[PDB]
Structure 1
Amino acid sequence: TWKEATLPQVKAMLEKDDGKVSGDTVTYSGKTVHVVAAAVLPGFPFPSFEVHDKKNPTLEIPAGATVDVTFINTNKGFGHSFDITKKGPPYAVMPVIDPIVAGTGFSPVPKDGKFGYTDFTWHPTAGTYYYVCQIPGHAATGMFGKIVVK
């Protein structure tokens, strides 16, 4: 479900991502990993996803791990989504990415000084997946990243 957090809270959650960055790649390790993504942190290009302070990085996940994903929409005016699919780029204006493997659906826009966020779990099998936002035109212009489970 959808929850709300104040800026100090958002800032504290962003540090909860336990991957290591190398180039434009974030590598996770362990039985349970925590991915913390944000939709357009302030200062970053629009439209885009930020994970561990990097723009649309490629995520490296160990096959068999339990993936705990936390998604925060910090972009004023838009209700970005965070959906995992198997279909890769390029995406159309209205992406055709069914079936979604795991996803959040459209998020609430920031309001009253609070930002919406949600959590979901994922147990993926080895392979290649893509996290994308389904708002028309967004994925088409770069709001997607790659996930490598191996």
Structure 2
Amino acid sequence: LDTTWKEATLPQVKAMLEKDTGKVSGDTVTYSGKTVHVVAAAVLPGFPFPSFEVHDKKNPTLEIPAGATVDVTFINTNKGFGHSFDITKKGPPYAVMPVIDPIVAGTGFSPVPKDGKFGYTDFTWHPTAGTYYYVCQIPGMAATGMFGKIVVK
């Protein structure tokens, strides 16, 4: 797993969130091009706990073209928590301790927010076509809705 992290101030977090290259319609975010840039955050201020936000949407379904390089940036903005972002082929419902191996791409547990800053990381992903899920592995979070769907085709 990706377990290397950097720290960002709030202006840096805002700058990064705006680099998501998706296009929104309803609760779907659609990506296009040779390399696509997904920027996800764990519980942005005021969004429902527990959830991921991508392109300002709660747990949206990501539509990714087959053959694209997927550059994921994951930011943990939720004070007191160490959320992860892990992609799996296993769908819901998830147990309190989700059983989702193998994790095809994703992170360990993130640093908890500290010192006025937020931990984030970047990883790359080259999926085969199919359906995937992005899931948090902190106990109980996926069971209470902290996941979303990815369609690569």
* TM-score normalised by L of structure 2: 0.98
Alignment of 1:114 with 2:117, yes or no, is yes
Shift of 1:85: 0.2
User: How far apart in 2 are the matches of 1:105 and 1:147?
Assistant: 19
Q: 1:17-62: CA deviations, max 9, x gaps? A: 0000001000000000000000000000000000000000000000
Distance in 1 of aligned mates of 2:124 and 2:20: 14
What is the Cα deviation at residue 16 of structure 1? 0.2
Q: CA deviation at 1:70?
A: 0.1
Q: Distance in 1 between matches of 2:98 and 2:119?
A: 24
Identity value in percent: 99
1:115 positional shift:
0.3
**1:105 aligns to what SS in structure 2?**
coil
Deviations 1:58-92 (A, max 9, x none): 00000000000000000000000000000000000
Listed as ranges, the gaps of 5+ residues in structure 2 are none
Aligned equivalents of 2:149, 2:103: Cα separation in 1:
14
After TM superposition, give the deviation of residue 147 of structure 1 in Å.
0.1
Deviation at 1:99, TM superposition (A): 0.3
- Cα distance in structure 2, aligned partners of 1:11 and 1:113: 14
Question: C-alpha separation between the residues in 2 aligned to 1:68 and 1:97?
Answer: 21
Counterpart CA distance in 1 for 2:76 and 2:147 is 15
Q: 3-state SS of the aligned residue for 1:140? A: helix
Q: Distance in 1 between matches of 2:129 and 2:107?
A: 21
- 1:10-89 matches, within 5 Å, as 10-89=13-92
Give the CA deviation at 1:117. Answer: 0.1
Aligned equivalents of 1:98, 1:114: Cα separation in 2: 31
Aligned to 1:99: 102
2-structure distance, mates of 1:54, 1:123: 24
The C-alpha deviation readout for 1:93-140, integer Å capped at 9, x for no partner, is: 110000000011100000000000000000001000000000000000
TM-score (norm 1): 1.00
User: What is the alpha-carbon distance in structure 2 between the residues aligned to residue 81 and residue 94 of structure 1?
Assistant: 13
Q: How many residues align?
A: 150
1:18, 1:115 → 2: CA distance?
22
